Amino acid sequence: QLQPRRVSFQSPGYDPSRPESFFQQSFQRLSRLGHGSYGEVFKVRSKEDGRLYAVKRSMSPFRGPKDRARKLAEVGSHEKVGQHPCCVRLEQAWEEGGILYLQTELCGPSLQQHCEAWGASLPEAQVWGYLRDTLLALAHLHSQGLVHLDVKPANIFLGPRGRCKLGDFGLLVELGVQEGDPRYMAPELLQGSYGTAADVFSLGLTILEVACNMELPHGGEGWQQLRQGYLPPEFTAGLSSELRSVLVMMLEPDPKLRATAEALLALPVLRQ
Ligand SMILES: Cc1ccc(O)cc1-n1c(N)c(C(N)=O)c2nc3ccccc3nc21
Secondary structure, eight states: OOOOEEOOOOOTTOOSSSSSOHHHHHEEEEEEEEEETTEEEEEEEETTTOOEEEEEEESSOOOSHHHHHHHHHHHHHHHHHOOOTTBOOEEEEEEETTEEEEEEEOOOOBHHHHHHHHTSOOOHHHHHHHHHHHHHHHHHHHHTTEEOOOOSGGGEEEOGGGOEEEOOOTTOEEOOOOOOOGGGOOGGGGGOOOOTHHHHHHHHHHHHHHHHTOOOOSSHHHHHHTTTTOOOTTGGGSOOHHHHHHHHHHTOSOTTTSOOHHHHHTSTTOOO
């Protein structure tokens, strides 16, 4: 019959019998953190060990072999990243009934959620720490030839004491493939050319969005203006000379000239 199988590249409180699924039997749904076409994310306490975790499950069963391989790839991308202080850590993953489950550590609200609740520009002190934490994460990914390709506030999750972690590695590619959010896409991605530089540009717009409380454009003339090498004067007025200068480096239209994550972390302004 149907049974959950581990996905990688047993739990008391769950009996192979009974109609309830492994997720329903071996976990306690505390609350729903999000839901969408991807599926649903729940904050849960596991009947196995009682600790707190976050679990993401796909919406509908696998349509076919390619849909299954695409969904399972996020687990593989998670494992290539390995454990890192600024990366959402995956505990375990399994599949049952054509549904894919990912169990990760529990984190705070997304950077998008957190900015929504405050409804204004974040204090530059918070911005620099978040910029640092994600640059540390990007430097970790880029050192292994991995490109996140979906850096945005929704995929950055806050941690205790003002820290944050990069998450959602569903679009991660290994150099040597999927549609991203156009609001945060690097200019060279339109003409193809994939590289680690794309994440730095995406992170620049995320920081530029959260530090200025500005809504990034999906397309049109405004989309182009953010990629000519200058910042919109209206929103970027409050930026300090240092922050504005770091953003200009990250928003450098030419990927050959754009600063790397390791380079930015070596700048004077960015000090642990
Ligand atoms: C479950 C999961 C799997 C892989 C990954 O990279 C991140 C998460 N994830 C977490 N680890 C989350 C958390 N608050 O701890 C969380 N919250 C989300 C809210 C809305 C939409 C998606 C979310 N996804 C989340």
